[PDB]
Symmetry: D2
Subunit: 115 residues, 4 copies
């Protein structure tokens, strides 16, 4: 495909927002806040990066069932650009189409249940 991929580690800013399309397909959107650590090297919170993420179907439902606001997650996916409404100003935004997502075990444990 030649897609631009990314791995992002961070915290969900809110509970995953679950919605179903007309066809019945689940769609979930959420924002990952990634805070780098940056006389100050790795011992001061840097400016956060906020990336909106989209995930679909069974993986979306898995996420809606498992994750909540503030959860630390590891996300891999592909960078996508999405484009107004009632203002005229036609703006583009970069988002992540999620390939895999999981809760990080850095500060937490998890009980996994396979589909």
């Amino acid at each position: 495909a030649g897609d631009t991929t990314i791995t992002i580690v961070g915290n969900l800013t809110a509970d995953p927002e679950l919605r179903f399309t007309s066809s019945g397909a689940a769609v979930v959107n959420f924002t990952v806040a990634s805070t780098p650590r940056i006389q100050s090297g790795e011992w001061k919170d840097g400016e956060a990066l906020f990336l909106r993420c989209n995930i679909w179907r069974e993986a979306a439902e898995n996420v809606a069932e498992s994750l909540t606001r503030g959860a630390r997650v590891i996300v891999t996916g592909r960078l996508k650009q999405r484009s107004e409404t009632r203002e005229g100003e036609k703006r583009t935004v970069v988002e992540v189409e999620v390939d895999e997502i999981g809760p990080s075990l850095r500060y937490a444990t998890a009980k996994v249940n396979k589909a």
Copy 2:
């Protein structure tokens, strides 16, 4: 200037879990990543993780668990001509079970 990597695959075994001299937790595991499209060629990366993270892994994961792993790729060579031997391994920065085919109960320990 580390070479970083993300790998998605399955734990080949239940994670090890040991404690060092200093009383520090260490966990070793191997991720088998196999790229419908039949079955592609597998990649088995040896991984290690330390401390609380290592304890969380050992309490949470089991053989076969699908995981997302990110970290730094390291390499060693064992030699003067004796047939060079080289190995790589991943010093894990973050690891979690993928929710692609599963759900999980998450508890901030």
Copy 3:
């Protein structure tokens, strides 16, 4: 640092724009257009991703000396969010702070001259 890194392959949409700050530091900005290939698998141009990139100092000058509009490049760097002026609407944008950049040798040759 815990930064979110990326590798992007694509073409410069224009000649690199070279500028110097008050201190005399070179700053170069450019946009990478990355076009994935996506009955149609890998044999149809997908929607392009356009990422604005920032690079500084000697590396910026190296780029201003070497690259032009349309050049195929490989870029690694870190994703950064940058925030109005005279409209009120306060908007964020995602950009790349470049760590390494080079012309791709996929369709081109290069004569490299070390600093």
Copy 4:
């Protein structure tokens, strides 16, 4: 589902350049990546690239050139107990000389 990687480092030697039975260009090279911070631990990744790209590499690059390489990580093991031997290598998707410490004259061949 390939495991991809990006590595930045220096060519350990002038790139090889050969032609296969079919008349297809192949190039093999090794990237040495060494992570002021003294000198960190080196990573040497064996790489291969094919066809026009391979010809471009061979005409453009020389030993020591700083390169940015992206591609797919592959692995093989040579065994029944004979002492397992494992190697990895990168099937290169894209490669270019870094402009971090250099300029370059670029010609669309």
